Design a protein around this ligand. Structure first.
Ligand SMILES: NC(=O)n1cc(NC(=O)N2C[C@H](F)C[C@H]2C(=O)Nc2cccc(OC(F)(F)F)c2)c2ccccc21
Length: 225
């Protein structure tokens, strides 16, 4: 997260860190008792850290789960950010409590109002040098209408109806925030894309996958256990 602030500890109990060999790689979002949603290129030794604020310090709520199965969206492709979703089935159902709870996710396939203030959280890089934070960061970002996001000087027609944008003027998602939650009105709306992109430039808005657009996919995979 560029231009953000340290989040309140445990105030986002749905927040996951998706890890490879005990190192943070992507954000994730607990969406069912045994399932974490993240982004497709995150998988390209997989564990999921729940109940955390600090990646390194002991916390009573923190628990690192093994992953039984990793299910990247079957239409996802290395060179694109289309269909950029990943579901991770934990080795067991997560132990729930005030610091570990799933997030309700949007099933109405219609756009949020332009300007809606959404929260994005993560352990991604925090400056141009690539500094990695030990504790969870967040930022409040206004949603940016699709027509502007698609203008020639911005993302030039790459924004489908299955993607949404937020403003990226100094406050932004960046590397390592991939897979994490864009939350609007207490509901999961988007997931941070995992394609490389310039961070913090107003002319290059943040891109997030619209979970409502993938409701059939998520329902099926969540039911496949
Ligand atoms: N949406 C958004 O703006 N971006 C998303 C990016 N992609 C990303 O993040 N990925 C790709 C994989 F899914 C693995 C993952 C990754 O690199 N993870 C990674 C690798 C090394 C360290 C790390 O931890 C760190 F703390 F640094 F973030 C994460 C990205 C890269 C550069 C700039 C913008 C970026």
């Amino acid at each position: 997260i560029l231009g953000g602030r340290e989040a309140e500890a445990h105030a986002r109990p749905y927040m996951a860190s998706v890890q490879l060999n005990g190192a943070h790689l992507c954000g994730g979002v607990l969406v069912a008792e045994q399932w974490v949603l993240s982004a497709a290129h995150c998988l390209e030794k997989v564990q999921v850290l729940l109940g955390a604020h600090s990646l390194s310090q002991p916390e009573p709520s923190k628990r690192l789960y093994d992953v039984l199965r990793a299910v990247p969206h079957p239409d996802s492709q290395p060179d694109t950010i289309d269909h950029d979703l990943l579901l991770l089935q934990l080795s067991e159902k997560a132990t729930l409590g005030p610091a570990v709870r799933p997030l309700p996710w949007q099933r109405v396939d219609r756009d949020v109002a332009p300007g809606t203030l959404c929260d994005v959280a993560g352990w991604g890089i925090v400056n141009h040098a690539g500094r990695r934070p030990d504790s969870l960061q967040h930022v409040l970002l206004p949603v940016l209408d699709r027509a502007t996001c698609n203008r020639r000087t911005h993302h030039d027609g790459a924004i489908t109806e299955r993607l949404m944008c937020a403003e990226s003027n100094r406050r932004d998602s960046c590397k390592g925030d991939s897979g994490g939650p864009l939350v609007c009105g207490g509901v999961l709306e988007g997931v941070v894309t995992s394609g490389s992109r310039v961070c913090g430039n107003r002319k290059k808005p943040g891109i997030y996958t619209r979970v409502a657009s993938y409701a059939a996919w998520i329902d099926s995979v969540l039911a496949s256990a």
